[PDB]
């Protein structure tokens, strides 16, 4: 409702995807870090991509 053609969909998808990736990695790493399991964010970022 704010932006026009290939800007409402383009920018809206970027915001949703960036927000989803940040929360998905945090949620996954919250589980392993509470159990003392250390995994590099590289591996989780590959799955979440």
């Amino acid at each position: 409702r704010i932006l026009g053609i290939p800007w409402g969909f383009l920018i809206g998808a970027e915001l949703t995807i960036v927000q989803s990736r940040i929360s998905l990695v945090n949620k996954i790493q919250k589980v392993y870090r509470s159990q003392g399991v250390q995994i590099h964010n590289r591996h989780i970022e590959i799955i979440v991509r």
């Binding site: 704010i2 932006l3 026009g4 053609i5 800007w7 920018i11």
Partner: peptide, 23 residues
């Protein structure tokens, strides 16, 4: 009535306008 419709402006393809509204 159609006179009042005539003031509504479409901005399709105007990147500079959408950049201003993005800011």
């Amino acid at each position: 009535v159609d006179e009042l419709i005539c003031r509504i402006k479409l901005h399709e393809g105007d990147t500079e306008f959408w950049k201003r509204r993005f800011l």
